[PDB]
Amino acid sequence: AVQTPHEVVQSTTNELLGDLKANKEQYKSNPNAFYDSLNRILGPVVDADGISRSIMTVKYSRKATPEQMQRFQENFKRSLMQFYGNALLEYNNQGITVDPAKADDGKRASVGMKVTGNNGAVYPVQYTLENIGGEWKVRNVIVNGINIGKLFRDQFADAMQRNGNDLDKTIDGWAGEVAKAKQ
Length: 183
Known about the structure:
By secondary structure, the chain is α+β, with helices and mostly antiparallel strands. The protein is 52% helix and 17% strand.
């Protein structure tokens, strides 16, 4: 579209924030109104199925029905804003720097970011994007040098071990698994 990988990361960042700042109080009392905004804003620029296919291996992702896949994402997205949503809400904080993106191969692309959080500590963030039908979408993020996509992947792997590879037990108990993946 009308958007390079750089414009995608900031214009979504601006979009997300000017909405979180304005509707904070309704989000603090209405997790579904929150969830609906997060989806309306992130969904169009986040490769949902790509993200999920990678957390499950392609091994397991291939033995998953659409119902299960669709159940997984819902469960995933929802524990995410459960355990991280507060931080975004209480982010009237400032200092959003989207680094000028390097060059891309027209298929993959990187975007860096620095965040001056709750004092003056700068935190680094690399976005990995991917081109899906002429559209740049976020596929992974590295936060404080922690590969997020690899973090949740090893959690799915660990759980599936413990659950003798039952997808439904792993998928229906995944919120509690994202809780553990803080630590």
